[PDB]
C-alpha cells in the first residue's frame, strides 16, 4: 500500500532537515551565540573589523557595551 512508500520519504525528510538545522546551530555556536554577521558591503566589513579590534580578544562576536 502507499504507506509502504513513506519510509524512504521519511529518511529523505530527515536527511534534508539536518543541513539547515545543523548550519544554523553551528553558525550560532561559532559566532558567540548570535547568527553570523553578513558583510554585504564595505560598511559592514568595517563595522565587523572595528568590533574585532575593540573586543580585545580579536573576536567580532564578543560585545562590549556601556561598561567599556
Amino acid at each position: 500500500m502507499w504507506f509502504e512508500i513513506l519510509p524512504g520519504l521519511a529518511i529523505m525528510g530527515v536527511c534534508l532537515v539536518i543541513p539547515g538545522v545543523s548550519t544554523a546551530y553551528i553558525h550560532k555556536f561559532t559566532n558567540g551565540g548570535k547568527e553570523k554577521r553578513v558583510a554585504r558591503v564595505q560598511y559592514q566589513w568595517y563595522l565587523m573589523e572595528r568590533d574585532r579590534r575593540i573586543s580585545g580578544v580579536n573576536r567580532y562576536y564578543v560585545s562590549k557595551g556601556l561598561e567599556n
Binding site: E4, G8, L9, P19, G20, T23, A24, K36
Partner: protein
C-alpha cells in the same frame, strides 16, 4: 568546526539522493500498480546501498578508443558541481553567503553540461556522440529563458542574493505575483536536470544509453548520483525562490522543516511526471522553448521591469 558543518551539509544530501532513487522506484511501481523494491531490507530501504556497492565493485570499463583524460574527468566534474551547488542555498542560513548567489548557481549549472559534453565526446562511440550533441541542444533551449526568468523574478527581490528572498517572501509567496513564470521555470528545471519528459540525452529508447553508454561501475554511478542530487537541488531552488517557507528570526528550524516539506513535494512531482508523460523529441524541445516560452518570457520581463515603476514598488537594495 566549519569542516563539521561541511560534513553535515554533504553526508545528509548524499543520503537523501541515495533514497531519492528508492523513492522513485517505489512511487513508479505503485503508480503502475506494482510494489517496487521491498525485499532488500525492510521495505526496500537497503536497495540504494546494495546498488552503490555493486556499482563500485563492478569492473570500470576503459574502452580502447576513448580519451582517458576526459573520460575520467567528466564524472568527477558532474558530482563535484552538483555537490557544490548546494553550498550557498539558505536553509535559512547558507553555509556560504554569496552576494551573487543566483549568478553563481547559473554559472555552476552551465558548467554542469560540460560533464555530459566531454563524456560523450570522449567515449568515441556513435551513441555517445548522439547523446552529447542532444545535450548541446538541450542547453541551447533552456539557457536562453532560464536567465530571463530569474531576472524577472529577482526584479522583485532587488539583489541577486538568495538570502534576500527570505525577507522578500516574508508576508507572501512569490508564486502568486509570478505564477506564470513559476511554470516556465519549473519546465526549465525539468529540462536542465535532463529528466522526463525532457530526458533526451540518455533516452534509453532512442539511444541505447546516451553519454553514459560506455561508462560502467563507479564512474557510471557518479553520473546518476549527480543527476539525482541535481533534482533535489533544483527543486530546493524552486522552493526557496517561489513557494517561500515561513521565516521567523526566532526559529530557523521552522524554515528548515517547511523547506524540507515543500522540496520533497516537488521532488515527488518530478517522478510523478516521469511516470505520467511521454518523451519530447529533441527538436520539439527547442521549438517548444524558443517559440512559446521565449516570446512570453520577454514580454513578462518587460512587464516586470514596468511593475516596480508604475506601482512605485521598487525593491530595496540591501
Amino acid at each position: 568546526m566549519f569542516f563539521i558543518n561541511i560534513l553535515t551539509l554533504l553526508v545528509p544530501i548524499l543520503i537523501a539522493m541515495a533514497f531519492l532513487t528508492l523513492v522513485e522506484r517505489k512511487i513508479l511501481g505503485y503508480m503502475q500498480l506494482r510494489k517496487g523494491p521491498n525485499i532488500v531490507g525492510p521495505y526496500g530501504i537497503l536497495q540504494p546501498f546494495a546498488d552503490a556497492m555493486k556499482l563500485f565493485m563492478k569492473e570500470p570499463m576503459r574502452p580502447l578508443t576513448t580519451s582517458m583524460s576526459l573520460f575520467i574527468i567528466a564524472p568527477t566534474l558532474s558530482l563535484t558541481l552538483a555537490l557544490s551547488l548546494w553550498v550557498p542555498l539558505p536553509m535559512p542560513h547558507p553555509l556560504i553567503n554569496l552576494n551573487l548567489g543566483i549568478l553563481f548557481i547559473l554559472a555552476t549549472s552551465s558548467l554542469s553540461v560540460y560533464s555530459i559534453l566531454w563524456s560523450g565526446w570522449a567515449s568515441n562511440s556513435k551513441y555517445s556522440l548522439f547523446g552529447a550533441l542532444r545535450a548541446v541542444a538541450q542547453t541551447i533551449s533552456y539557457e536562453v529563458t532560464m536567465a530571463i526568468i530569474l531576472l524577472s523574478v529577482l526584479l522583485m527581490n532587488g539583489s541577486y542574493s538568495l538570502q534576500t528572498l527570505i525577507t522578500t517572501q516574508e508576508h507572501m509567496w512569490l508564486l502568486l505575483p509570478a505564477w506564470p513564470m513559476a511554470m516556465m521555470w519549473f519546465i526549465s528545471t525539468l529540462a536542465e536536470t535532463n529528466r522526463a519528459p525532457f530526458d533526451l540525452t540518455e533516452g534509453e529508447s532512442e539511444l541505447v544509453s546516451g553519454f553514459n553508454v560506455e561508462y560502467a561501475a563507479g564512474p557510471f554511478a557518479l553520473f546518476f548520483m549527480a543527476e539525482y542530487t541535481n533534482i533535489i537541488l533544483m527543486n530546493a531552488l524552486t522552493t526557496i525562490i517561489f513557494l517561500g517557507p515561513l521565516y521567523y528570526i526566532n526559529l530557523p528550524e521552522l524554515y528548515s522543516t517547511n523547506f524540507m516539506m515543500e522540496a520533497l513535494l516537488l521532488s515527488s512531482t518530478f517522478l510523478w511526471i516521469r511516470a505520467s508523460y511521454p518523451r519530447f523529441r529533441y527538436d520539439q524541445l527547442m521549438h517548444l522553448l524558443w517559440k512559446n516560452f521565449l516570446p512570453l518570457t520577454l514580454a513578462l520581463c518587460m512587464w516586470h521591469i514596468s511593475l516596480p515603476i508604475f506601482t512605485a514598488g521598487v525593491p530595496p537594495y540591501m
